[model samples]
Target chain A: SDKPKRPLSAYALWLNSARESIKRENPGIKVTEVAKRGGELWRAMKDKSEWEAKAAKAKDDYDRAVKEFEANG
Target chain B: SDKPKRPLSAYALWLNSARESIKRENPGIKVTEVAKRGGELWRAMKDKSEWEAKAAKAKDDYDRAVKEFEANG
Candidate 1:
C-alpha cells in the first residue's frame, strides 16, 4: 500500500544532512549520541524559520495528497 | 538494491508489541514519551533472554543472508 509521506520537522531535515559529518567529527559515536549532538547543533543554529517553513509546505502538500488519494477510492 | 535487514534487540521487539497498549492507556502520548514508557517497561520485564535468543538467531540469519547475497554477484 502506498502511503503519503509524513512531514518531518525542521530539526529532522537539519539532522539528516548533518548526521554523517557529526559522526565523522566524533569518530565511533553511538546513534543516540549523534542525535544528542544533533539536538545541540539544532539549538545552536541562528535561523531556523527557513527549514520550518519548508516543513510546513511539505505538511500542506501531504494533506492535499492524502485527501486526493482517499478520494480516488 | 536489496539489503539484509538488521536484527533488532529484545527490548525493541518488546516495545514494538507493547507500544499500542501503552498509548491506549495514556491517551495522546507523545512519541518520545512512548519510548520512555517502553524503556520503563523493558527494564521492568522479568525474563528477556527468550526474546534475546530469538534476536541472536535472527542476527545469525542476517549474517548468512548478507554473505550469500554478496556471493551472488
Candidate 2:
C-alpha cells in the first residue's frame, strides 16, 4: 500500500540541488515548478518516518565524507 | 532643552516612503543611507513623547484621509 511521506530537510536540500541543476540545463524554466514536483515525489516515496530516517543518515554520511576528504587533502 | 526622540511607526513609514522616492530618482544609490539619515533627523526632533504623539496623530490623519478618499471615489 502506498502512503504519503515528508522528506527530512537534508533530503529536501538534495532534491532542490538536483532541480537547480536541471533548471540550469533548461533556461527559462520555472524552478518553483520543479520544487513542487520534487516535494510531491518525496511525499510519494514511502512512510514519512522511514524517509526522514534515511534522509538523516544520508546527511550524516555526506557530512563525514566532506570532512574526511578535506582532512585527507 | 532638546532631547532624543524615537519616531513612531507612522513617521517611520513616511520617512521610508520619502527615502524610496529618492532611491527611485537616483538609481544605484543606497536607500539604507537615507533611512539612517531620516532616523537621525527624527531622533533630533524635540521630545520623545511629543514626537510619538505627533506620529500617532499623523497616522490617524492618514488613515482618515485614505478612508475618505476611498469612500468618495
Candidate 3:
C-alpha cells in the first residue's frame, strides 16, 4: 500500500542525498556506514546555507501537512 | 495513520530535554531561541551518556514497529 509518510526536515533531505551518493559509490554497502559517513559530514558543516532554504521549504510543507492531518483526524 | 515514527537518536533525546528545560526557564520564549540554545549545548557536548540507552531503546522499538507494520500490510 502506498501510505502517506511524515514530512522530513531539510537536514533529513540533505543527509538523504548524502546517503544516496554514498550508496551509489559503494553499491551493496550496509546502511550503517552510509549513515555514519553522512552523519559526520552533517556535523562538520558550518554553512547551513546548503540546506537552510530546503529546511525552510520542508518546514512549511510539514506545517501544512500537519494542518491537513489535524483536519482529517 | 498515527504510525510509529522513526526513532530519535541519543542526540535528539538530549536535545529534547534541553528544549523542555529552556521552555520552563524562559516562559513565552520563541521556539527559535530554544532550539538555538539546545543546538549550542548539543554541539558542545562530547559526552553521550545522557540518553544513549534511551536512544538505543527507541531505535529498537522503531525497528520492531516497522517490521510489524510491514507484516500487517
Interface RMSD of each: 11.6, 23.5, 13.0
Q: Model 2 in CAPRI terms: which quality?
A: incorrect
Candidate 3 per-residue lDDT, tens place, A1-73, comes to 2324666765687886677777888888787887777777775655455464555445445556666676775
Give candidate 1 misplaced runs (Cα > 4 Å). A1-73
lDDT of 1 by residue, A2-39 (tens): 56556667787667678788999999887789888988
User: Any runs in candidate 3 off by more than 4 Å, and if so which?
Assistant: A1-73, B24-28
- lDDT, candidate 3, equals 0.68
DockQ of each candidate's interface versus the true one? Answer: 0.02, 0.01, 0.03
Clashing pairs in 3: none
What's the C-alpha lDDT at position B36 in model 1? 90
Q: What overall lDDT goes with each candidate model?
A: 0.76, 0.55, 0.68
> Lowest summed-lDDT stretch of 10 residues in model 1 chain A?
A1-10
The TM-score obtained for chain B of candidate 2 when compared with the true chain B: 0.40
- Candidate 3 lDDT over B1-73, as tens digits, reads 4678789976688977777788888899997888788877765664554465566556556767787887887
RMSD values for the candidates in order, in angstroms, are 14.9, 20.9, 14.6
B1-73: candidate 1 lDDT, tens digit per residue? 5878787877887677676556534434589999898988888889998879878888898899999889886
